Structure 1
Amino acid sequence: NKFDLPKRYQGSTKSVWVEYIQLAAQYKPLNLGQGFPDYHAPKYALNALAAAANSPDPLANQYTRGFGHPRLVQALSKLYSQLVDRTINPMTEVLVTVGAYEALYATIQGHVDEGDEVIIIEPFFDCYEPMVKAAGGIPRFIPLKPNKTGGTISSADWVLDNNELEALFNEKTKMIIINTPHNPLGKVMDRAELEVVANLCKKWNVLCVSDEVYEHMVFEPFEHIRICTLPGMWERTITIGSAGKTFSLTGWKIGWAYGPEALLKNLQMVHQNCVYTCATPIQEAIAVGFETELKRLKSPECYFNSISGELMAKRDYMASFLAEVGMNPTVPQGGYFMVADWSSLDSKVDLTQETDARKDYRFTKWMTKSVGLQGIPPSAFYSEPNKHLGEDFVRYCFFKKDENLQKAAEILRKWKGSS
């Protein structure tokens, strides 16, 4: 008891991640659970890391500026200044962090004090709730729910109850966390939903935290819209991005938070006495990535532009083979995850020997063991009392080699064909 966790980690769980990493190592299924590319990222980013390691400058591999590598943050402000259509100060309005993860951490620790209520949308990215709780905050959850059922559906169909949302704000609301494009639904919030959240933030003096890591992977004909761009919102928005999702190099763990300096000062105090600085040769390589892209921004071969169409064909392909097998897929407006409703297969599969509390866990582990195809359970992304809303579903990642996609389609075809 003496050396037990401090109180502020009451509800403290292992991530669903570990146990599925262990299951995939044991049975070696066709793995649709990892939210990263089967195959290699754009070379030029990669080449830049090799160049920074090989650099003739002795300081390329020594400590860099704590709030962001200079060359890094100059490029960030260039890219974002054009997209948010104001000039972002690279030195005071941009903070570089150990992924979008540590950006989320600096923000939540910097702006959530004991008892502040933070509004979270379900299904949530996994870190959201434990970070709120560790900061002494109180989570307030509200789920996105399909406004239809059967085949045949879009991530725009998953919506909040507007009245519910409204009643969740009061003079105790410190913060709201919105994630768009949404993990794992793929829902890209349209102007009116953003407008809804914006109008509630202004009323209630709430800080909006905008997790825009999949900013660049919105599918035609949908469009990504930043909430820090809406009226009066700049002053009350921290927007978060990630190099790992921007350049498909998730093992690089560099991200950023941008916003007014008044909001960012809070992150800085947390950051300097948490990690202090980030890796120089990686930030250097990302700065050269951004510089390569900044030269050809309007151009189709810009990775920010190209990546949508690269994914879309796999998006469409997966939605097809999952519908073929008897699921109803939610077609994502953006990103690379797909949520599919498998419940009409529940009479065709034997979950008897599966011991998890939740049926999506049973189903997704049975599928690994029985036919060698791994997905992830969406109920791991809900607050205990709402877990029932994710049990009919499964999460698959389609950022995969065309041949591995085709193998998943026939593992499923041949499972159905007999049964």
Structure 2
Amino acid sequence: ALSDRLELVSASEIRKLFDIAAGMKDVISLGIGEPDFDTPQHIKEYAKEALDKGLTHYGPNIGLLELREAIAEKLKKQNGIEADPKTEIMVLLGANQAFLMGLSAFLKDGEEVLIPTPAFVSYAPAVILAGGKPVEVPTYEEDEFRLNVDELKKYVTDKTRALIINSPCNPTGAVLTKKDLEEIADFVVEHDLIVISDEVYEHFIYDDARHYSIASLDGMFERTITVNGFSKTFAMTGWRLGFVAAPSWIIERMVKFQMYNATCPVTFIQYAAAKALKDERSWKAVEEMRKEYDRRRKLVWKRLNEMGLPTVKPKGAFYIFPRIRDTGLTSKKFSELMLKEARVAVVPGSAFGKAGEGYVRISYATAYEKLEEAMDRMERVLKERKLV
């Protein structure tokens, strides 16, 4: 039963870090998994307009049609994904809902779900809650943390039914290239898996990197649940609005699940997001945010490396994952030390899976000045403790 599965889910290491950091002052948090920017004003204005228009009643379990149509257009233009807004697109209370609900549309007892690690903290627990068995597939820093099909093939079994992909990736910041996705797609097809693609950080890509969606690849829509949302893209984390595009049979089961869960997303919020998707100001805001994230990203990448922590330059999202194993400390002890002496909160790499052990996650979704200060604090401790 669900209660048994919930008991199998381990307590959060990020939760533990927060509880401790909170009880201390002068601490700079680098464990934030959300934008620091406020929601663009014009979007706030669209929400106010929706409130004046009286859009405060229930909407379809699947989401407002107007929003689904706006999402279909965004998917087509930006991602090359063709999805019918009437049956293949569902709005959710944040993109986070997609994993538990999406997997519940097909996952059977004991079936395995390949989860490339380091991985976002929601994946494994969602698999366990759905009734399956999570199977971690390590990614390596020498591969810029890009998932390698060589690794997937070693961990796949006859019990494997799904694969969860995340690009741009949280916590590594890795971006899967088109060739990477083509190879993953072939593997997915070969093993008759359903692949869930988490693309919420799609717009925060840097350097020469481009965002490709696996569902846009030849014959992939029939076996892909594309997950995205407005939380990162429009700095709307507190608005709780995400969405998925998938075959209608999966969508039908997801709305059925929703009928006994959150029912439907916030009506006036959906109206604002539909208007936001078609407003040039929304995208100009996305560009400004990406620019600032990039400025902070170059700061932390250079500082981490120069202070003695080999760090892969992230190509997407707003996270960076420095190697800390050479200091002789475990990810947890490294985080404990930084919180106590540097007054800087970083997430132990192990929180993202075994492959994350030996690393630590730092989020640069915070003021540049705060980042400069946290870098100095961290470097001070590393050098004083002779860890570098």
Q: Provide the TM-score with structure 2 as the length reference.
A: 0.92
Specify every segment of 5 or more residues in structure 2 that has no aligned partner in the other structure, as ranges.
none
CA distance in 1, matches of 2:33, 2:133: 29
In structure 1, the partner of 2:207 is 220
Which one of the candidate residues 64, 77, 89 is aligned to 2:59? 64
Which one of the candidate residues 3, 7, 11 is aligned to 2:4? 7
Q: Deviations over 1:291-317 (max 9, x none)?
A: 214xx79xxx63344433221111000
Which one of the candidate residues 348, 352, 375 is aligned to 2:346? 375
1:120 matched to 2:91: no
1:184 matched to 2:171: yes
Q: Quickly say closer, same or farther: Cα 1:7–1:291, change in 2 above 3 A.
A: same
CA distance in 2, matches of 1:411, 1:103: 38
Which one of the candidate residues 49, 52, 59 is aligned to 2:50? 52
SS of the counterpart of 2:70? helix
Residue pair 1:120, 1:142 contacting (<8 A) in 2 also: yes
Residue pair 1:341, 1:394 contacting (<8 A) in 2 also: yes
Question: CA offset at residue 86 of structure 1?
Answer: 5.4
Which one of the candidate residues 72, 80, 89 is aligned to 1:85? 80
Q: Supply the RMSD in Å over aligned alpha carbons.
A: 2.2
The aligned amino acid for 1:30 is I
In structure 2, the partner of 1:152 is none
Question: CA offset at residue 391 of structure 1?
Answer: 3.0
1:233 matched to 2:220: yes
Q: Deviations over 1:389-408 (max 9, x none)?
A: 43321111111112212222
Q: Quickly say closer, same or farther: Cα 1:270–1:331, change in 2 above 3 A.
A: same
In structure 2, the partner of 1:32 is 30
Question: CA offset at residue 157 of structure 1?
Answer: 2.4
Q: Deviations over 1:141-196 (max 9, x none)?
A: 2100122xxxxxxxx52244543322433443211111111111111111222111
Specify every segment of 5 or more residues in structure 1 that has no aligned partner in the other structure, as ranges.
148-155, 352-358
In structure 1, the partner of 2:359 is 393
The aligned amino acid for 2:277 is F
Question: How do 1:121-160 residues align onto structure 2 when only pairs under 5 Å count?
Answer: 121-147=116-142, 156-160=143-147
1:256 matched to 2:227: no
Which one of the candidate residues 355, 361, 365 is aligned to 2:336? 365
Residue pair 2:293, 2:365 contacting (<8 A) in 1 also: yes
CA distance in 1, matches of 2:21, 2:7: 30
Which one of the candidate residues 313, 331, 345 is aligned to 1:331? 313
CA distance in 1, matches of 2:144, 2:292: 24
The aligned amino acid for 2:352 is F
CA distance in 2, matches of 1:67, 1:257: 10
Question: CA offset at residue 229 of structure 1?
Answer: 1.0
Range 249-258 or range 31-40, more displaced? 31-40
In structure 2, the partner of 1:355 is none
Q: Deviations over 1:102-140 (max 9, x none)?
A: 111210111211122211111111111111112221222
Q: Quickly say closer, same or farther: Cα 1:360–1:267, change in 2 above 3 A.
A: same
Which one of the candidate residues 287, 294, 297 is aligned to 1:312? 294
CA distance in 1, matches of 2:224, 2:37: 35
CA distance in 2, matches of 1:327, 1:16: 22
Q: Quickly say closer, same or farther: Cα 1:197–1:161, change in 2 above 3 A.
A: closer
1:22 matched to 2:4: no
Residue pair 1:169, 1:200 contacting (<8 A) in 2 also: no
Q: Quickly say closer, same or farther: Cα 1:176–1:343, change in 2 above 3 A.
A: closer
Q: Quickly say closer, same or farther: Cα 1:167–1:395, change in 2 above 3 A.
A: closer
Residue pair 1:75, 1:290 contacting (<8 A) in 2 also: yes
Question: CA offset at residue 211 of structure 1?
Answer: 0.8
SS of the counterpart of 2:8? coil
Q: Quickly say closer, same or farther: Cα 1:12–1:414, change in 2 above 3 A.
A: closer
In structure 1, the partner of 2:189 is 202
Question: CA offset at residue 367 of structure 1?
Answer: 1.1
Q: Deviations over 1:360-385 (max 9, x none)?
A: 11221221121211111110111xxx
Q: Quickly say closer, same or farther: Cα 1:84–1:342, change in 2 above 3 A.
A: closer
CA distance in 1, matches of 2:324, 2:81: 45
SS of the counterpart of 1:44? helix
SS of the counterpart of 2:373? helix
State which structure, 1 or 2, has the greater radius of gyration over its C-alpha atoms. Answer: 1
